[PDB]
Amino acid sequence: YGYVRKVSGPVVIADGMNGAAMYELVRVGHDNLIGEIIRLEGDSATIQVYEETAGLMVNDPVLRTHKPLSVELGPGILGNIFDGIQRPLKTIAIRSGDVYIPRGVSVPALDKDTLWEFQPKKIGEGDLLTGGDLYATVFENSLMQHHVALPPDAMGKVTYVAPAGQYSLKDTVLELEFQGVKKSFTMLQAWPVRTPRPVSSKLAADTPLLTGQRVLDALFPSVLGGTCAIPGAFGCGKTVISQALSKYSNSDTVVYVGCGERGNEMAEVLMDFPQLTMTLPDGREESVMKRTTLVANTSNMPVAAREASIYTGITIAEYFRDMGYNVSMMADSTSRWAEALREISGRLAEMPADSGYPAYLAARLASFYERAGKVKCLGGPERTGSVTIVGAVSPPGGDFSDPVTSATLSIVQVFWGLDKKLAQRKHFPSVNWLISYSKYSTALESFYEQFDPDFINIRTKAREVLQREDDLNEIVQLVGKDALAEGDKITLETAKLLREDYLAQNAFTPYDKFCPFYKSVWMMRNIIHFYNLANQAVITYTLIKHRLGDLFYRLVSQKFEDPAEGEPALVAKFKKLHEDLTAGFRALE
Template identity: 50%
Template structure:
């Protein structure tokens, strides 16, 4: 017994190093032979969370993710033998974590303070909550399962049902499956046996943050991420599972766009990772999104790269619901915000000349089925905006009166597009969110007006009978006003059928008005 006790003491001492030096969040430690890269360590008597980022002999360089003031040379550094990992399972939705997945709400309740005490070690997923577990119908004792197979589900909230999967490295024959009932996340709900070894499984999966989650198959992104913002949905669409960059200067509306996407996009789960200024906006986010909504919010900097954080279900389509591990390095969609547009109070301040989308080809089959007219409308609208930019330089030199009548039509329709289609009032009930049917209907009427006006002014005939832009503006003033007022139709009050009927009626009257104008 004494020999066994001595061996355990030696093993315990071999897992403890000592602090050699402290420089801000970087700590060097000695007596760390046998440690592994990215191993989780507890530094000092307060057991601060750290990670090994460099090894040289028995010296290790540690990245400490907490305040290191008070650390001294000689303080203990305890190795855990495990990498830095996150807990995945029921309870993650609606929670708020700091950069190392410490639950801020639980810490505040336990400490009664707005500050996080150093060395706090609280489970990320709540252990006191019970979940209504329902096993899969086709799973029973004797069934063979492997990583990624769904063995049950729980109601995460009123919106989502959380499917429980066998961990990627687990497999075997089911020897126990819990009956329907209420269980905690740490309770054993499944037991597997493989090659004579039994493995109990709970609802929690502990996953290293720097390790990519495996996938069975990457599904193609061929369905649009509908944002409710006309400039994005119509001109620069993004696919579900795609990546988008939204750069912009201070005051350009990055926050408003990100929150609009979170509130109105066709997504099941929103994960908010805030760092620096973005983290300071969490107060408004939490006020607008009540508890129990689709937000698993994260404030802080995760101690991992974007390629190693397990992606939420809707962030990348995968077979059997398994998460994607690595995001593309270069975004396929670029929504560039313009400081000048923001200064003119044009929001969303997305510059239509520098923004782009490389997802158009992937979305062609979807548009052919749902809105076959949209690709041609998009191309025409972008061409009008591009021509307007070129004509603006000529107008500055020689004036608008010297332009051809067709160019005058281009300028005026481009103004309609910019002021009444691309621009949206995010704080209004009627225009903070624009359904896709309304976006397509508005764009179709504007492009139809442009084509009819160009055909009218470019028509052949005697000089005194030719139609000019001034004639169109005077004779079709009511049509122009109604085109401008299309955005005021409220999707909630008016409904889809009524709005589409109004747009169709406007188009018929527009065609009739141009016909009578020509006569």
């Protein structure tokens, strides 16, 4: 019930919708075009339709949905591929057979006829349960067990519990009554993208995001449930860091979110993920897709879907965190999302602000980024998850002055700063140590000292060495290495060794594909301790340089060792090398 009255491009006016609500999604026309309500002036409505509105007919029916832009969560959310508006691309392609996306597809987000193995918890048929209680878990696939949380805003004494067995989402797995009225819940939960997910308490982040790369792990650490920023426009560093996060990061899940980038780039990345495979610490070999969800909205996709992809991804990440899993979101191109928002604002004729973006761009970006953090779960049993966002930025020409870049730098705690200059100089990590920073180091210092009380001092010494590296750089630039003192020469040599041996990774090489934090800490110790032990001896720089050739080779090889030997063997080898270097530095003095 409801018919269109005026169709001016994307904007659509439909009469007979007195009961419509603002921002309620609606189905327009026989083709089931999907659009969101904007203005409810009079008894009429106003809808902007995402897909092309060409060919609409006056008095074509309009069908309400009684729900805002929402995502159907539950089993089967992992692995698949979804559009910006939560449209399963893979199943759409299989059903329609052809390649083109049909104008008005109506495939449900998750297949409601597929069977998943279900088994309840030890709860009783007449017990009491509340919102967020974990009443069952499902083996969606191997090694990615999926907990079934009773939806929030739903509570009451238990009435029926489905016994363990094979079931589908259409089955009524749960039914309960709060008052005399009883409600039955399936395995599918719908939640609006704009509304965040209910939380019990925002904890303080207390565990680093071990990305497997030494430069990010030690120099500029990032904590679970913490924002991150990447100036990714070239050098494939964004692809490299995304692959590292998918394969080696501590997160139990990853939710890539791609909006408004080049279509072939998304093709390349979405073909790269299935090829990516990660080995289990127990020796098992798995596929990253078994723990990966992908929301990719190319430029050809409607602008509104491009804007909504980010919120869809963050809501998916929050739902994953609802069962205490550590999940990491990855916004492919926030600049593209901002451009989509700008286009939408221009469609709405909103008053332009700085550089043309709407005045709420900073506010909306902050609202999105504020959802990341380590959070106590809702409902029992007690557990705690985390959501960390590693959303990248694409400043125009590298000038960190655009409002998107400025707002992101103002909100994001940790900025890693990939540099194209290092990429030109053949640097695999490509992380510019001169601009990167980790504002969460003060909070992470508790764990840093618990693991090793000397590690934080080593990090401070390394930061001082990096600061003096540029000083020695202009010193050599203006007068040369001749004017450098023995201590200055030792400091410069140690800085160069740190840059070319530990601060840089080798990625492609099997020995340096993954850098454990243990190996990173031992390498940092074997570098800094040797640097000091050589420093206080000032001894002729040439003499120590000649007599430390074996020590220099050991320091260089302190990163060539493969992780095959494991932590106990590599730690012992690094300790022996450090002791030998200390003996050589002290005895020869």
